[PDB]
């Protein structure tokens, strides 16, 4: 049920990103700042072997904490394997490289109980084109929670 970006060129995604919007299949995955998938991307770091480090922040004990997820390449440039956040896959749905990137995380063993997707932007501003693409990509996905952040939140501590 999940699109992939064909021919993703990972080298072109390196840098800071901001989580502009996120949505999940289960409310509890994103409900409250403590939710397990309430993670805010800070940076994408493609590696020399073509794997991807995903640097995130999350609230922990009243502080914005860092978490690094190692995502390992597969035969499809846009799909990476992980072992974090109870997930086992990262899918890059679409990117223009220069402005936005859409991705989802899930666990193959139960996507309906694990799907979370994000709209990332390079600059901490609302990009309505990117949000339109995100919402279109998600149109037929079974999301039950959706959040979209404003520039103050993007400049805040862990999106507050
Ligand atoms: Cl957690
Ligand atoms: N490239
Ligand atoms: N759910
Ligand atoms: N919250
Ligand atoms: N990959
Ligand atoms: N996992
Ligand atoms: N697109
Ligand atoms: N591009
Ligand atoms: N926009
Ligand atoms: Na980087």
UniProtKB/Swiss-Prot annotation:
It comes from the Eukaryota. Keywords: Disulfide bond, Milk protein, Retinol-binding, Secreted, Signal, Transport. Alternate disulfide bonds occur in equal amounts. Lactoglobulin is the primary component of whey, it binds retinol and is probably involved in the transport of that molecule. Belongs to the calycin superfamily. Lipocalin family. Pfam families: Lipocalin. Disulfide bonds join 64-158, 104-117, 104-119. Transmembrane segments: none annotated. One of its GO terms (molecular function) is retinol binding. This is Beta-lactoglobulin-1/B. It is found in: Secreted. GO terms for cellular component: extracellular region. CDD domains: lipocalin_beta-LG-like. Under physiological conditions beta-lactoglobulin exists as an equilibrium mixture of monomeric and dimeric forms. SUPFAM superfamilies: Lipocalins.
